[model samples]
Target: CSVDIQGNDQMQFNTNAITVDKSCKQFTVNLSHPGNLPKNVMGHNWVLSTAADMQGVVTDGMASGLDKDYLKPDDSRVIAHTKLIGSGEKDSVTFDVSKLKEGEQYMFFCSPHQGAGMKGTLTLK
Candidate 1:
């Protein structure tokens, strides 16, 4: 499914769940940053990976720093990701439906706010 989500300085995401159909040739996510904080202090990014990979990814990402969007560089668990965005900035990512396997557990969440409001799931049909 095509989705649009917004993030704020409060470290929150606009949506918590998303669904996708395998029949779709492409799935896109549009992310907008509505807060006034700079990318260094309160940056936000949209990251996708397998459900089992979420915890590790988040842990390692936090150590990778803001320049890497809190994600380890070239980590395979990440299926797709958008650049770190700050206030008044926006980003988007489009991936092939083939990247998603039927019934596989997949999810999306932000790096800095994973434990808070920056999480969601993507189920492929």
Candidate 2:
């Protein structure tokens, strides 16, 4: 099964947790922005990484700027990510289940403002 999540202008994510079934060969995350703001003003992207790598990824992404969708190009630490979007825009990313591990702690968050309290946890079942 897949998960659907939304990021709003208030820098909040609709879901705090996600679960992926290991038996599935692929899983998807559908991201949407329902606010009325421009992407540059209050953009959001779904970035996934190991718990230990989240902060570093977010820091590097902040420097990458909006043109790069607030993500480091070709960042190996990113397991999967959706394109940055603003109000009325949407993006999706599907990844192989093999990218996840049973015991690892995976965290997802928005860049540039993750410390502003927009983040979530991911798990494999």
Candidate 3:
């Protein structure tokens, strides 16, 4: 299971939902911020975790700051993540599908701009 997603200058994503086929042994996420904006001004990245922790992940992520891709180092709650990227730049993260549990609700988002509509859900199909 692999997904390619996009982020824009408006801090938005191209899609709001995604699904992972259960047959996949591994999953990959490709994230790109398309535009001329520099990373410092338009920071974006992909973070995957359970729906319940999505809220706290954002808070603690803020503390981790940009140096950590807006994420805590070695966080168990995070299943996959992409480094922070800016306009015209890209990043990717791959993880075993076995890391995910069936029927477990999951959510994915861009760390810095969750409210800008860069958040979505991922489901095991």
User: Which candidate leads the pack in TM-score?
Assistant: 2
Q: What are the lDDT scores of the predictions, listed in order?
A: 0.87, 0.91, 0.87
* Cα displacement (Å) at residue 28, model 1: 1.0
TM-score of 3: 0.94
Q: Is candidate 2 or candidate 3 better by lDDT?
A: 2
Ordered list by lDDT, greatest first: 2, 1, 3
Q: CA RMSD for every model? A: 1.3, 0.8, 1.1
TM-score-wise, the better of 2 and 3 is 2
Better of 1 and 3 by lDDT: 1
lDDT of 1 by residue, 1-125 (tens): 68898988988887777888767899999999996898888889999999999998899998998767899989999999998898998999999888888768988999888977578888876
Clashes of each: 0, 0, 0
lDDT of 2 by residue, 50-94 (tens): 999999899999999888989999999999999988999999999
TM-score of each: 0.93, 0.96, 0.94
Which stretches of model 2 miss by more than 4 angstroms? none
